[PDB]
Structures are given as C-alpha cells and as structure tokens.
Amino acid sequence: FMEVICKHYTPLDIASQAIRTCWQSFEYSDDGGCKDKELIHRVGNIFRHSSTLEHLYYNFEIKGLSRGALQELSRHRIASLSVKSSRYTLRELKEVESFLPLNETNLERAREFLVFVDNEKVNAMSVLALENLRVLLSEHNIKNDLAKYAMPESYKTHLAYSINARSLQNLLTLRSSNKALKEMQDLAKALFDALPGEHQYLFEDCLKH
Amino acid sequence: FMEVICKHYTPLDIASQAIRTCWQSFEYSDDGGCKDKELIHRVGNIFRHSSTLEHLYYNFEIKGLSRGALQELSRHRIASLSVKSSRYTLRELKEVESFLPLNETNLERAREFLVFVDNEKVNAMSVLALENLRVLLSEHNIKNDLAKYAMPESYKTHLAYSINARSLQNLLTLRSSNKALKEMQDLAKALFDALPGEHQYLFEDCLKH
Amino acid sequence: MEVICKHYTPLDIASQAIRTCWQSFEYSDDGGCKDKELIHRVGNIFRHSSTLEHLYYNFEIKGLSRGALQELSRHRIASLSVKSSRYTLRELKEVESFLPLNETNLERAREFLVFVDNEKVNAMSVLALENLRVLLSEHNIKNDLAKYAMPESYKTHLAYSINARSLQNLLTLRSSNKALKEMQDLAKALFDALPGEHQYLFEDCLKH
Amino acid sequence: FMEVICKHYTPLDIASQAIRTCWQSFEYSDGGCKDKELIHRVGNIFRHSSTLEHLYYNFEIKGLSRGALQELSRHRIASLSVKSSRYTLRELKEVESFLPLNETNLERAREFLVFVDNEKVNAMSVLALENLRVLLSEHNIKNDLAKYAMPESYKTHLAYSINARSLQNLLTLRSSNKALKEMQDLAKALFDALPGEHQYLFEDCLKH
Ligand SMILES: Cc1cc2nc3c(=O)[nH]c(=O)nc-3n(C[C@H](O)[C@H](O)[C@H](O)COP(=O)(O)OP(=O)(O)OC[C@H]3O[C@@H](n4cnc5c(N)ncnc54)[C@H](O)[C@@H]3O)c2cc1C
Ligand SMILES: Cc1cc2nc3c(=O)[nH]c(=O)nc-3n(C[C@H](O)[C@H](O)[C@H](O)COP(=O)(O)OP(=O)(O)OC[C@H]3O[C@@H](n4cnc5c(N)ncnc54)[C@H](O)[C@@H]3O)c2cc1C
Ligand SMILES: Cc1cc2nc3c(=O)[nH]c(=O)nc-3n(C[C@H](O)[C@H](O)[C@H](O)COP(=O)(O)OP(=O)(O)OC[C@H]3O[C@@H](n4cnc5c(N)ncnc54)[C@H](O)[C@@H]3O)c2cc1C
Ligand SMILES: Cc1cc2nc3c(=O)[nH]c(=O)nc-3n(C[C@H](O)[C@H](O)[C@H](O)COP(=O)(O)OP(=O)(O)OC[C@H]3O[C@@H](n4cnc5c(N)ncnc54)[C@H](O)[C@@H]3O)c2cc1C
Ligand SMILES: O=c1ccn([C@H]2C[C@H](O)[C@@H](COP(=O)(O)O)O2)c(=O)[nH]1
Ligand SMILES: O=c1ccn([C@H]2C[C@H](O)[C@@H](COP(=O)(O)O)O2)c(=O)[nH]1
Ligand SMILES: O=c1ccn([C@H]2C[C@H](O)[C@@H](COP(=O)(O)O)O2)c(=O)[nH]1
Ligand SMILES: O=c1ccn([C@H]2C[C@H](O)[C@@H](COP(=O)(O)O)O2)c(=O)[nH]1
Ligand SMILES: O=c1ccn([C@H]2C[C@H](O)[C@@H](COP(=O)(O)O)O2)c(=O)[nH]1
C-alpha cells in the first residue's frame, strides 16, 4: 500500500565490465548480451566476489511508509536516505479539520497521514493520537520540536532512498523474511517490484525463503 | 533526566602507538605521556590523518532516550547499536495500572515509560497515547507488532551503543549544535560527560559552537 | 593515465532528495537554475551533505600504478574491481625480453610500467620488470609466487564507483600538495572526466 | 611467520550485555555459562550478528608484505595505520650492498623482504631491493620517486583495529584455500593472537 518508484538505476553493463576487469576477460564479452547478463548473476553470487555488485546503484522514492518502519529501515547502514523531517513539516496538520468523531469518512481522511494495519482498534487509537497531535499544533500553536513527542509511530513519512545492488540484496533477504515486520515485508516486495525488469533476476531469489 | 554510561573504552596509548607506526617515530614515545597525548590531539585533528582516532572505541549504555531521538541517532551509520525492541518488549505494559485519571500520581508513573518535554500539554497527550497503548495490549491482548503502531514517539527506549573516537567527534559536533533537537543536544553532553576525563580533551572542541 | 566516466546519476535525483526533507516541491523549477544551486548550497552544509550521496559515478581507470592503487584502496567508501596480478600475470609469458635498455625496449616497457620523472628509477623498474618476465616465461613460476618480485610501478586497471560526497573527500585529500604526485594526477583526471554539468560541485575541492 | 600481537580487546561481557538489551532479559544473565554461549548463539543468527560489532580488537602486525597489504586494505570495515614508504624508505640509506647473493646477504635482505617458497623469486626480490637501495643511497633520489622501484615483497608494519563481526568475515574469506598463502598465514596469526576466551567465536570461520 506504500508507493515505491525507482527513479534511476545503473545500466547492467557497468557491472559486467567491472567483473571482466578483474580477470581481463573482455575477449569473452558479448557486448551486453545474455552471456554478459549471465556473468553478473553467477559471479555476483560467489561471496568473495559479491563486491562487484556494488557498482549497481538504485535511486528510489518511497511514499507512505510509517515512522515505525522508518526506525527499522534506518538500521541498514549501507545506504543513503533523505527523509521528510517532522521537525519542519508538522505544520501540515495546522490546516486540516478534526478527525473526531471516528466514523467511516474521518477514518478515510486520517489515512492520508497514518499507516493502518489489520486491526480496527489499533487504527482507531492511531487516529486518536493524530487528533491530539492536530490539537497541539492547531489550537495551542506548540512548536514542532515539542509536538512531535505526541506523534504515533504509524505516522506517514516520505523519503528518497539510494542503495547499491549488494546492499539491496542483504536488505531484501532480511526484510522479506517471516521474522520481519509485516510492513517491512511489504516494503521489500514493493522495492523489488520497482526495479527495472531487466535487473530483477539478480534479486529474484533473495525473496525466496 | 536520561542516563549514559561508558562501560569500556580503549586506552589512549593504543592511538599513540598507531600514529608512531606510520612514520616509524617510535623513537620519541614516552609510555603515553605528554609527548604521546599531544601527538594524538595534534595529528588526529589533521584531517588527512584523522584515521588515527578510529583505533579508540567506546562502549556506552544509554537509558531514557525517546524513540523520537532514536530515529535521529540511528542515522549515524558509523557506529553499532543494540536496541530494546518494542516488537518483543511491549508486553511490559500488560501488567501495570491505568494512567487515568491524569492526576499528579499517574503523571509521574507515566514518566517511567515516556520522555517528558518542556510543555505540559504535550506530555498530557503522550500519556493519553500511552494509556490507549496499554488498553490495546492489556484489555484486548493485541500483538506487539500491531499495537506498536499506536505508540507515541516519546516512548522510552534503552540501548547499547559503541562508537569509535573519529565517528564520536562527528556525532558530538553535529548534535551539540543549536540546530539539533533539544534531546539530542542533551545526549551529546551526556555522552561527553560519560567519557574518561583523560579522553575528554579530544572531544571538548566538538561542543564549542 | 586514462580515466573515463562510464555512467553518472542525473543532477535532479539529488535535488529531489533535498526537497523531500523540507517538502519544498512547490518551489522547484524542474532541474533548472534554482534546483542546481540548491544542490550546491545545501549539499555543502555539513549536516545536509549526505544529500550528495544520492549522486553516483561509475569510472574506468587504466594506467594506474600498483603503488597508487595502495593509496586509492584506502578510501573505504567506494567500490573497486581491480585487475588481479594473481590471475593476469600470464600476460608476460608472451612478450620479448626488455633487455638491452635501449629506447625500443623502454617504450615497450611503458606498456606495463608507470614511468616517473627520473630516468634512473625508470631503468630500475624495467630491470625489475625483466626479472619478473624471466620468472614467468623461462622458469614457469606460479603467479602467486612470482608476484612478490613485482615492482610497485607495474600498471593496473580498475572499475571504480563512488558517490558525490565521497568523491568530494577523495578530490580534496588527493589534490593537496602533500599527496603523491600520481594521486594528484588521478584527482585531476577524475574531475576532468566528470560531466561538465556536475563539475561545479567538485571544483572547490581541488582549490588549495 | 609474520608477527601479530593483540594489544587490546573488549571484554566479552560487553556483547552479552548488548544482546540482553534487545529483549530486556538481563534477568537470566550471569559473562558466565549463559552469556558466552548466548553470544555465540545469537551472534551467529545473521539478523542479530551486529551484536558482535561491540567487540573491538586492536592488533599490531609486523612483517607483512606490501603485496598482502593490497589485499588486506580491501577490507573496508576496519581501521589501519601503516608505515609510510614515502617517509621511512630512508631506512635503506645506511645498509651495505646485498650483492653478491650469498647465504649471508640473503639472510640480511630478509630484514626488509618477505620470502616465499621459491629461491628464484626470493633472489629477484633481493635484486630489486638492491637497486632500490642504490637509487636511495648512491643517487640520493627522493622517496616519492624511488618507491616505484620497490618490490611488493617489501615489508610493512601496521596497527590494525577491527570488530568481531568484521573479523569473522576477514578470517572466513582469507583462510580459504582460494586465498594467497600469506593471507592464509595472516588469518591464522590473527586468530592465534586472540585471547583464548574469545577464540570459540572465530574458530569455525577457519573451517572449510
Ligand atoms: C528480523 C529482525 C529483527 C531485528 N531485531 C533487532 C533488535 O531487536 N534490536 C536491534 O538493535 N536491532 C535489530 N535488528 C536490526 C539489525 O541488528 C541490523 O542492524 C539491521 O538488520 C541491518 O543489518 P546489517 O548490519 O546486515 O545491514 P547494514 O547495516 O546495511 O550492513 C550491511 C553489511 O555491512 C556490514 N557492516 C555494516 N556495518 C558494520 C559494522 N560497523 N561492523 C561490521 N560489519 C558491518 C555487515 O556485513 C552488514 O551485513 C533486527 C533486524 C531484523 C531483520
Ligand atoms: C540538525 C540536523 C538535521 C538533519 N535533518 C535531516 C533531514 O531533514 N532529513 C534527513 O533525511 N536527515 C537529516 N539529518 C541527518 C543527516 O543527514 C545525517 O544522516 C546524520 O546526521 C548522520 O550524519 P553523517 O552522515 O555525517 O554520520 P555517519 O552516518 O556516522 O557517517 C560518518 C561519516 O562517514 C561518511 N559516510 C558514511 N556513510 C557514507 C556514505 N554512504 N557515502 C559517503 N560518505 C559516507 C561521511 O563522511 C560521514 O560524515 C539531520 C542531521 C542533523 C544534525
Ligand atoms: C597525503 C596523505 C598521506 C597519508 N599517509 C598515510 C600514512 O602514512 N599511513 C596510513 O596508514 N595512511 C595514510 N594516508 C591515508 C589516510 O589515513 C586515509 O586512510 C585515506 O586518506 C582515506 O581517507 P578517509 O578515511 O577520509 O576516506 P574513506 O575511507 O573513504 O572514508 C570517508 C569518510 O568516512 C568516514 N569513515 C570511513 N570509515 C570510518 C571509520 N571506520 N571510522 C570513522 N569514520 C569513518 C570518515 O569521516 C572519512 O573521512 C594518507 C593520506 C593522505 C591523503
Ligand atoms: C580469494 C579472493 C580473491 C579476490 N579477488 C579479487 C579480484 O580479483 N579483484 C578485486 O578487485 N578484488 C578481489 N578480492 C577482494 C574482494 O572483492 C573484496 O574487496 C575484499 O575481500 C573485501 O571483502 P568485503 O567487501 O566482504 O569486506 P569489507 O570491505 O570489510 O566489508 C564487510 C562487509 O560490509 C559490507 N560492505 C562494505 N562496504 C560495502 C559497500 N560499499 N556496499 C555494500 N556492502 C558493503 C559487505 O557486506 C561486506 O561483506 C578478492 C578477495 C578474495 C578473498
Ligand atoms: O540506464 C538507464 C536507463 C533508463 N533509466 C531510467 C530513465 C527513465 O526515467 C526510465 C525509463 O527510461 P526508458 O525505458 O524510456 O529508456 O528509466 C535509468 O535510470 N538508467
Ligand atoms: O524487526 C526489527 C526489530 C527491531 N529493529 C531495530 C530497529 C530499532 O532501532 C530497534 C527496535 O525496533 P522495534 O522492535 O521497536 O521495531 O531495533 C529492526 O530493525 N527490525
Ligand atoms: O534534526 C534532525 C532532523 C531529522 N533527522 C533525520 C532523522 C529521520 O530519519 C529524519 C526525520 O527526522 P525528524 O525531523 O522526524 O526528527 O531525518 C535527524 O537525524 N536529525
Ligand atoms: O600519501 C599517502 C601515504 C600513505 N598512504 C597509505 C597507503 C598505504 O596503505 C600506506 C603506506 O603507503 P605508502 O606511503 O608506501 O605509499 O598508507 C596513502 O594512502 N597516501
Ligand atoms: O586474492 C586476492 C586477489 C585480489 N584481491 C584484490 C586486492 C587488489 O586490490 C586486487 C588485485 O590484487 P592481486 O591479485 O594483485 O593480489 O584485488 C584481493 O584482495 N585478494
């Protein structure tokens, strides 16, 4: 339910040229053909040689991820993030109407700002929290730096996320697992699906458990 | 109101022995005294050689930091964190009593789970979010993975945190700034105060702005 | 020494990241004047310089010495794939002796060696090179053994990838006058190989 | 046959404490029977292997070749401080000639070179060492130029700091039979320099 766009990626040939550089086997190259694609996959997955995959870089856009899931995504250190800052954007709530009383319309309205999960009760509490947050900002005009303390973890964030193919493999493996938080499994799937189809074969098996 | 402890640190002479290895200046060593300590500060502060500070490691324990602050601390990638997981530890609320009504007694009780800031209205909302979370967990027995979504960012976390001196200088410079969140400025001062007095000269200027 | 930029991230990737933090998309100009200056002004504030990490550059580097390779590999926030001596020394099993040290064998020698501005050093490098050739061809010694007699002037070849924030750091450190000369040359060749459009983010790094 | 010393290490109880911090389960703790096995168990779950990063090791390595240095430098999650050839090469300016090659001078050349399992290679290293010595002593050529004539068997000295998680990776990769012999030697030496109590964390890494 969160939106992931791959905005830029590294042509695969960058990877195969890199691999051939090591053993100087350009003679065996087929000018970016299927044998070159095959090479990235086979060598890229020998552990000692997985650093060749680092030459492939992906620039993503992620919309509608919860702050709670951001906590976990942030722990993958081999990546670059630029994240919508609550310290400077919370005033977005100053302008909206109350979400109380809870009812179908207000619950739909609140989904613009909150990630809902598959429990009605939890979602109701997130809206209650969102409403209190709205009041702090809107009626008492409290600063963002203080008000953010009342914000629920289901609050939506937005980010640019950039990551190389070797780190992306690690991410996909850890977060598509059944031990992983449901939202992180969805993020993993959404990131895979955002990849160009031509690159997806390098990652296809990370999601296999 | 938050506590940082330095559990273990690398002896200073470890860094001096490393500087003297580059240019083989082991001749002018003095068991780590004024000749060796002057060297660490002097050379390590030279950017092309700040690499020498990376040999010093600090193991901290940090108590009473909010999840909000944790989002910011997590973005310092050159460091190691082990964090109390809400996915596994939220059942801690299942035992305790209602925090309603919001009387003076229940406010203090709520402080054990929440970071309070310098605004009474914010804190009151944090406590309301806390009580809804307790209700989800205790009255409805909702699983941690779902309930955490209604958790407020003022919720307290607890972590083990290890960092080398070069990265710690960066962290202290960035988070003692006037532009950093108040809780993070406070963490910066506390990390510094937790350091052995002997080591503090390497970091004092980081705090000067 | 040959440096080529095979691929590079479009500038607007970085400007979209910057605008994401403060949600300032209304004020965008679609990778125009303002978007471009935004990347420069904000990317150079230290607390926001991680914005430049979204820009990635893929390079090919030919003609670098193993000596300078020692120094380039010390930049840890980068990716390299390097021609391996353990596997490619076989290249010497073919060629003809480089003795005597006449101008025809010296020329042939620069195929495999980085020469410096001293004729005597270069001659020593060629002599080390001929003994390496001797171990490989005449005695058929394993690569893993003969490689110990390799001179540090021996040429290497690598794919190198690095992001803008780390490239700023590389170019600053290595264009200094304290840097080995060959590394100063590399810094300059990397800058020169960047798209003209990106160069304004890096040129101050060279200014000492 | 290179010399590896562990100058300082982190107490094991630091990782057991970090591990317990995740689950708030210090209640069952003791760095006793539960703790040491806890570290080994949890550390080896890939999703929780970052608990091992709290353990840090400061080593000194003496007598490693420049050639092996190229490879060791490729492990980027570590800190190294290395004897600079650009400044310390003046060390050769004093010694006598290494020629002619005889049992005595071969022994003297070992002070400066790593020998491998072939006499012919070792002789060529000495030849290159002697030329290097001439450039420096007789021609008074600066280190920055002369280093290009240096053989990769030249010895280096370094301080090396690394955390348990990165060290496991290092030992696994470098103790392979696919690795350069010297690196396999180094992997064994690092393991052996570890305090006995920590070794059970790494011994499996050496087993292929
Ligand atoms: C199911 C699950 C449960 C989790 N539970 C917890 C928890 O309870 N508490 C908690 O604190 N965290 C928890 N985490 C986070 C976890 O500890 C990692 O920080 C996170 O998964 C990122 O993993 P990573 O280090 O492999 O990836 P990255 O940080 O992106 O690192 C990529 C690779 O680089 C290497 N690397 C990066 N930095 C270092 C370093 N400094 N030292 C050595 N090697 C390094 C490692 O090989 C790593 O695999 C959990 C993660 C998952 C998937
Ligand atoms: C006041 C303030 C406001 C902030 N606002 C925002 C915000 O609005 N949005 C947002 O997303 N973030 C924000 N941040 C986070 C900031 O962008 C950094 O991610 C964070 O502070 C960690 O800084 P660091 O990268 O220097 O440290 P670390 O991640 O620990 O890195 C240490 C050093 O290693 C180098 N390094 C590490 N990784 C890389 C890499 N991948 N590429 C190149 N070099 C690397 C850099 O030199 C860095 O200084 C803010 C930080 C501060 C202090
Ligand atoms: C003129 C010159 C002379 C030199 N002489 C010597 C010498 O005699 N001996 C020697 O050993 N080296 C020498 N060096 C190498 C130098 O010490 C660095 O290893 C190298 O320049 C790369 O610098 P860097 O760490 O900043 O870059 P990177 O390794 O790419 O790191 C980028 C940035 O990320 C951060 N970072 C990366 N890793 C860590 C880490 N683990 N901990 C904290 N922060 C980290 C730092 O902020 C760093 O600036 C020399 C370098 C120069 C330019
Ligand atoms: C037998 C053998 C043969 C080799 N042959 C060659 C060769 O022919 N040519 C050549 O160029 N190199 C060669 N190498 C070097 C190899 O490619 C690695 O650069 C080196 O082994 C370091 O491995 P590492 O990246 O896993 O370790 P580290 O650099 O210490 O990294 C530790 C872990 O952190 C993670 N990590 C660190 N940086 C990044 C990054 N930027 N992106 C994603 N993840 C990261 C990875 O998970 C990694 O496992 C060889 C190595 C071995 C062991
Ligand atoms: O190597 C490439 C090729 C294309 N694209 C991007 C540019 C466009 O935004 C998108 C679609 O491009 P085309 O399929 O039209 O080429 O993919 C890349 O990021 N890298
Ligand atoms: O599945 C998990 C569980 C925990 N963590 C990390 C993120 C936080 O820094 C800390 C606690 O996360 P939560 O369990 O509260 O989500 O550990 C993850 O990355 N993934
Ligand atoms: O002062 C700041 C502001 C932002 N961020 C990072 C943390 C989050 O990943 C993201 C948004 O943080 P908040 O503004 O919500 O705190 O940017 C910081 O690290 N420090
Ligand atoms: O200017 C320098 C000097 C040293 N080093 C690093 C590279 C080697 O790992 C080690 C010693 O190299 P040399 O001084 O021999 O070049 O220190 C550099 O990176 N740049
Ligand atoms: O076994 C190897 C082979 C290669 N490399 C890396 C180190 C060098 O940067 C490059 C080529 O090294 P040599 O084959 O020349 O040793 O690849 C290693 O680290 N270990």
PDB file of all heavy atoms in Angstrom, chain D residues 56-71:
ATOM      1  N   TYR D  56      35.717  -5.106  20.045  1.00  0.00           N
ATOM      2  CA  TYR D  56      36.724  -4.466  19.217  1.00  0.00           C
ATOM      3  C   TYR D  56      38.118  -4.983  19.576  1.00  0.00           C
ATOM      4  O   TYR D  56      38.425  -5.179  20.757  1.00  0.00           O
ATOM      5  CB  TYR D  56      36.665  -2.963  19.454  1.00  0.00           C
ATOM      6  CG  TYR D  56      37.166  -2.096  18.325  1.00  0.00           C
ATOM      7  CD1 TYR D  56      36.603  -2.178  17.056  1.00  0.00           C
ATOM      8  CD2 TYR D  56      38.163  -1.139  18.549  1.00  0.00           C
ATOM      9  CE1 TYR D  56      37.050  -1.360  16.029  1.00  0.00           C
ATOM     10  CE2 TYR D  56      38.607  -0.308  17.545  1.00  0.00           C
ATOM     11  CZ  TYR D  56      38.052  -0.421  16.283  1.00  0.00           C
ATOM     12  OH  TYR D  56      38.479   0.408  15.272  1.00  0.00           O
ATOM     13  N   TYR D  57      38.959  -5.173  18.557  1.00  0.00           N
ATOM     14  CA  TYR D  57      40.308  -5.720  18.742  1.00  0.00           C
ATOM     15  C   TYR D  57      41.359  -4.815  18.137  1.00  0.00           C
ATOM     16  O   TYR D  57      41.300  -4.498  16.951  1.00  0.00           O
ATOM     17  CB  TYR D  57      40.419  -7.106  18.106  1.00  0.00           C
ATOM     18  CG  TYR D  57      39.393  -8.062  18.633  1.00  0.00           C
ATOM     19  CD1 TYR D  57      38.175  -8.220  17.979  1.00  0.00           C
ATOM     20  CD2 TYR D  57      39.612  -8.775  19.812  1.00  0.00           C
ATOM     21  CE1 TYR D  57      37.205  -9.072  18.473  1.00  0.00           C
ATOM     22  CE2 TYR D  57      38.639  -9.635  20.316  1.00  0.00           C
ATOM     23  CZ  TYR D  57      37.441  -9.777  19.637  1.00  0.00           C
ATOM     24  OH  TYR D  57      36.465 -10.621  20.104  1.00  0.00           O
ATOM     25  N   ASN D  58      42.321  -4.399  18.948  1.00  0.00           N
ATOM     26  CA  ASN D  58      43.453  -3.634  18.432  1.00  0.00           C
ATOM     27  C   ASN D  58      44.694  -4.515  18.252  1.00  0.00           C
ATOM     28  O   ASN D  58      45.265  -4.999  19.221  1.00  0.00           O
ATOM     29  CB  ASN D  58      43.778  -2.470  19.355  1.00  0.00           C
ATOM     30  CG  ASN D  58      42.548  -1.673  19.749  1.00  0.00           C
ATOM     31  OD1 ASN D  58      42.045  -1.791  20.870  1.00  0.00           O
ATOM     32  ND2 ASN D  58      42.061  -0.855  18.833  1.00  0.00           N
ATOM     33  N   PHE D  59      45.109  -4.719  17.006  1.00  0.00           N
ATOM     34  CA  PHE D  59      46.276  -5.553  16.705  1.00  0.00           C
ATOM     35  C   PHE D  59      47.473  -4.748  16.262  1.00  0.00           C
ATOM     36  O   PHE D  59      47.331  -3.648  15.737  1.00  0.00           O
ATOM     37  CB  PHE D  59      45.950  -6.506  15.571  1.00  0.00           C
ATOM     38  CG  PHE D  59      44.909  -7.508  15.899  1.00  0.00           C
ATOM     39  CD1 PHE D  59      43.611  -7.343  15.454  1.00  0.00           C
ATOM     40  CD2 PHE D  59      45.226  -8.635  16.625  1.00  0.00           C
ATOM     41  CE1 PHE D  59      42.641  -8.283  15.738  1.00  0.00           C
ATOM     42  CE2 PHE D  59      44.275  -9.574  16.908  1.00  0.00           C
ATOM     43  CZ  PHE D  59      42.972  -9.400  16.463  1.00  0.00           C
ATOM     44  N   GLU D  60      48.660  -5.306  16.446  1.00  0.00           N
ATOM     45  CA  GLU D  60      49.826  -4.842  15.706  1.00  0.00           C
ATOM     46  C   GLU D  60      50.297  -5.966  14.760  1.00  0.00           C
ATOM     47  O   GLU D  60      50.394  -7.129  15.169  1.00  0.00           O
ATOM     48  CB  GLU D  60      50.945  -4.421  16.654  1.00  0.00           C
ATOM     49  CG  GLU D  60      52.037  -3.592  15.979  1.00  0.00           C
ATOM     50  CD  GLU D  60      53.187  -3.217  16.917  1.00  0.00           C
ATOM     51  OE1 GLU D  60      52.965  -2.385  17.832  1.00  0.00           O
ATOM     52  OE2 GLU D  60      54.315  -3.745  16.732  1.00  0.00           O
ATOM     53  N   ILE D  61      50.547  -5.627  13.495  1.00  0.00           N
ATOM     54  CA  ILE D  61      51.059  -6.589  12.515  1.00  0.00           C
ATOM     55  C   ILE D  61      52.445  -6.150  12.031  1.00  0.00           C
ATOM     56  O   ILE D  61      52.624  -5.022  11.561  1.00  0.00           O
ATOM     57  CB  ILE D  61      50.148  -6.702  11.264  1.00  0.00           C
ATOM     58  CG1 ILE D  61      48.662  -6.767  11.641  1.00  0.00           C
ATOM     59  CG2 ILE D  61      50.562  -7.877  10.386  1.00  0.00           C
ATOM     60  CD1 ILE D  61      48.309  -7.879  12.538  1.00  0.00           C
ATOM     61  N   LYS D  62      53.425  -7.037  12.148  1.00  0.00           N
ATOM     62  CA  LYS D  62      54.792  -6.719  11.721  1.00  0.00           C
ATOM     63  C   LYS D  62      55.279  -7.758  10.733  1.00  0.00           C
ATOM     64  O   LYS D  62      55.005  -8.945  10.893  1.00  0.00           O
ATOM     65  CB  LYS D  62      55.723  -6.647  12.926  1.00  0.00           C
ATOM     66  CG  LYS D  62      57.004  -5.864  12.682  1.00  0.00           C
ATOM     67  CD  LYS D  62      57.468  -5.178  13.960  1.00  0.00           C
ATOM     68  CE  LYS D  62      57.107  -6.007  15.195  1.00  0.00           C
ATOM     69  NZ  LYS D  62      57.247  -5.228  16.465  1.00  0.00           N
ATOM     70  N   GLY D  63      55.965  -7.313   9.688  1.00  0.00           N
ATOM     71  CA  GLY D  63      56.476  -8.235   8.687  1.00  0.00           C
ATOM     72  C   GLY D  63      55.494  -8.746   7.638  1.00  0.00           C
ATOM     73  O   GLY D  63      55.662  -9.849   7.108  1.00  0.00           O
ATOM     74  N   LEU D  64      54.478  -7.949   7.329  1.00  0.00           N
ATOM     75  CA  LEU D  64      53.555  -8.257   6.239  1.00  0.00           C
ATOM     76  C   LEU D  64      54.091  -7.653   4.928  1.00  0.00           C
ATOM     77  O   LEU D  64      54.651  -6.559   4.934  1.00  0.00           O
ATOM     78  CB  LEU D  64      52.155  -7.700   6.558  1.00  0.00           C
ATOM     79  CG  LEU D  64      51.022  -8.087   5.606  1.00  0.00           C
ATOM     80  CD1 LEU D  64      50.613  -9.536   5.839  1.00  0.00           C
ATOM     81  CD2 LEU D  64      49.814  -7.155   5.739  1.00  0.00           C
ATOM     82  N   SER D  65      53.933  -8.349   3.804  1.00  0.00           N
ATOM     83  CA  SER D  65      54.383  -7.773   2.534  1.00  0.00           C
ATOM     84  C   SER D  65      53.481  -6.631   2.019  1.00  0.00           C
ATOM     85  O   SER D  65      52.303  -6.558   2.343  1.00  0.00           O
ATOM     86  CB  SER D  65      54.541  -8.856   1.466  1.00  0.00           C
ATOM     87  OG  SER D  65      53.299  -9.268   0.929  1.00  0.00           O
ATOM     88  N   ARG D  66      54.038  -5.736   1.212  1.00  0.00           N
ATOM     89  CA  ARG D  66      53.218  -4.729   0.563  1.00  0.00           C
ATOM     90  C   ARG D  66      52.169  -5.419  -0.302  1.00  0.00           C
ATOM     91  O   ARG D  66      51.042  -4.945  -0.410  1.00  0.00           O
ATOM     92  CB  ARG D  66      54.069  -3.809  -0.303  1.00  0.00           C
ATOM     93  CG  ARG D  66      55.196  -3.124   0.441  1.00  0.00           C
ATOM     94  CD  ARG D  66      54.787  -1.752   0.914  1.00  0.00           C
ATOM     95  NE  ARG D  66      54.390  -0.909  -0.207  1.00  0.00           N
ATOM     96  CZ  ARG D  66      53.767   0.255  -0.070  1.00  0.00           C
ATOM     97  NH1 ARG D  66      53.479   0.709   1.142  1.00  0.00           N
ATOM     98  NH2 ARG D  66      53.428   0.965  -1.140  1.00  0.00           N
ATOM     99  N   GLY D  67      52.545  -6.532  -0.932  1.00  0.00           N
ATOM    100  CA  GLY D  67      51.610  -7.312  -1.726  1.00  0.00           C
ATOM    101  C   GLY D  67      50.373  -7.790  -0.962  1.00  0.00           C
ATOM    102  O   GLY D  67      49.246  -7.676  -1.448  1.00  0.00           O
ATOM    103  N   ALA D  68      50.584  -8.345   0.230  1.00  0.00           N
ATOM    104  CA  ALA D  68      49.481  -8.769   1.094  1.00  0.00           C
ATOM    105  C   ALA D  68      48.718  -7.559   1.640  1.00  0.00           C
ATOM    106  O   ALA D  68      47.536  -7.639   1.926  1.00  0.00           O
ATOM    107  CB  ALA D  68      49.996  -9.628   2.235  1.00  0.00           C
ATOM    108  N   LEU D  69      49.412  -6.436   1.776  1.00  0.00           N
ATOM    109  CA  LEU D  69      48.778  -5.211   2.217  1.00  0.00           C
ATOM    110  C   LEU D  69      47.695  -4.787   1.229  1.00  0.00           C
ATOM    111  O   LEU D  69      46.628  -4.355   1.648  1.00  0.00           O
ATOM    112  CB  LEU D  69      49.804  -4.085   2.387  1.00  0.00           C
ATOM    113  CG  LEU D  69      49.169  -2.764   2.831  1.00  0.00           C
ATOM    114  CD1 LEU D  69      48.526  -2.929   4.195  1.00  0.00           C
ATOM    115  CD2 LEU D  69      50.183  -1.597   2.830  1.00  0.00           C
ATOM    116  N   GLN D  70      47.967  -4.905  -0.071  1.00  0.00           N
ATOM    117  CA  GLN D  70      47.000  -4.523  -1.095  1.00  0.00           C
ATOM    118  C   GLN D  70      45.681  -5.228  -0.805  1.00  0.00           C
ATOM    119  O   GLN D  70      44.599  -4.632  -0.893  1.00  0.00           O
ATOM    120  CB  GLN D  70      47.477  -4.930  -2.493  1.00  0.00           C
ATOM    121  CG  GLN D  70      48.651  -4.132  -3.050  1.00  0.00           C
ATOM    122  CD  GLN D  70      48.222  -2.888  -3.819  1.00  0.00           C
ATOM    123  OE1 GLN D  70      47.043  -2.536  -3.859  1.00  0.00           O
ATOM    124  NE2 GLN D  70      49.188  -2.216  -4.434  1.00  0.00           N
ATOM    125  N   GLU D  71      45.787  -6.501  -0.437  1.00  0.00           N
ATOM    126  CA  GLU D  71      44.613  -7.339  -0.223  1.00  0.00           C
ATOM    127  C   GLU D  71      43.938  -7.030   1.102  1.00  0.00           C
ATOM    128  O   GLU D  71      42.718  -6.882   1.169  1.00  0.00           O
ATOM    129  CB  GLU D  71      44.999  -8.821  -0.328  1.00  0.00           C
ATOM    130  CG  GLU D  71      45.686  -9.140  -1.659  1.00  0.00           C
ATOM    131  CD  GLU D  71      45.905 -10.626  -1.899  1.00  0.00           C
ATOM    132  OE1 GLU D  71      45.883 -11.408  -0.922  1.00  0.00           O
ATOM    133  OE2 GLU D  71      46.109 -11.015  -3.074  1.00  0.00           O
TER     134      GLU D  71
END
